[model samples]
Target: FWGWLNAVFNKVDHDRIRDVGPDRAASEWLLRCGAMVRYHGQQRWQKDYNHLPTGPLDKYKIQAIDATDSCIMSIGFDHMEGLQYVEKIRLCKCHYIEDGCLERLSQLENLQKSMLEMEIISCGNVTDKGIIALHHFRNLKYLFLSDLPGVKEKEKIVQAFKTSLPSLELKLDLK
Candidate 1:
């Protein structure tokens, strides 16, 4: 079945996380799904899963994630549970991302504290519900949303974020 295939592709390996550490394990998940990750203090993005660097576990903390056109979905989001330093994330044209994914992401304790900037563009499945859920990230400073046709209650979402995060810089391009 299609669901089985998707589940297989999105499986989270707790053993891997325990073996290589959080950031390294997360990089494997992201790169496996065709997403890219930028490590803290590194200028280059890690795009190839096989090319990922191996060294001291603490040397590669994930600083950013670019999941444009990637297959990452909510089922595999447990990979994010251990990430502590992720600051920026962009989910552009990610067909599998949805409201549930955002809600789950906001529940991550570490991410809520470290997340700073996020952009959700051309993701047709995301709606006002998902956008609103982002308010849980109290430290989030900038958020950009564009080309999301499913987000009908844009005004409500804007108002909600404004109230929840007074200092947040939110940008929307719903057209």
Candidate 2:
């Protein structure tokens, strides 16, 4: 029953998106799952889901996400589908994230275009396949990965990214 409820909680609320717009809706999902986000023009991070600021529908554009030690998983990524200004994302100690999560995130057209920096650390389920899938982020400039034991073939993964994204600043601490 607990798992079922959690699954339900992670489901995207399209109606909420319609009411508050994509950024707000995505904020709700991220915060609900223990992640934090920064808005485009704001220096402070929004961490409380209930205390989200009230403004014009498009006022709060998501610029960065820091999901360190969060429960966010793949099922909730649908909330990000409509976001257009997300530039940076950090996922550290996220136990629920897996290869499929990275795959889905990279497949988001808007995110692929807008994302500039991403960091994945200590995500146990992320393997070489997931890291390699990140090449789809054509505009991504910086990528940092560390402590991911599931990632073997580090040389091959690095080579793949070097070939596909020559300008990317890739950092790894997989040892």
Question: What CA RMSD would you report for each candidate?
Answer: 1.3, 1.1
lDDT string for model 2 (2-112, tens) is 577668768999998998888898888888889999998989999888898876657889999999988888888899899999999999999999999999999999999
Q: What TM-scores do the predictions have?
A: 0.96, 0.96
Where does candidate 1 clash, by residue pair?
Answer: none
Residue 144 alpha-carbon offset, candidate 1, angstroms: 0.2
Best by lDDT: 1
Tens-digit lDDT string for candidate 1 (111-173):
999999999999999988998999999999999999999999899988998799998999888
Global Cα lDDT for candidate 2? 0.91
- In angstroms, how far off is 114's CA in candidate 1? 0.3
Which ranges in model 1 have alpha carbons more than 4 Å from their true place? 2-5
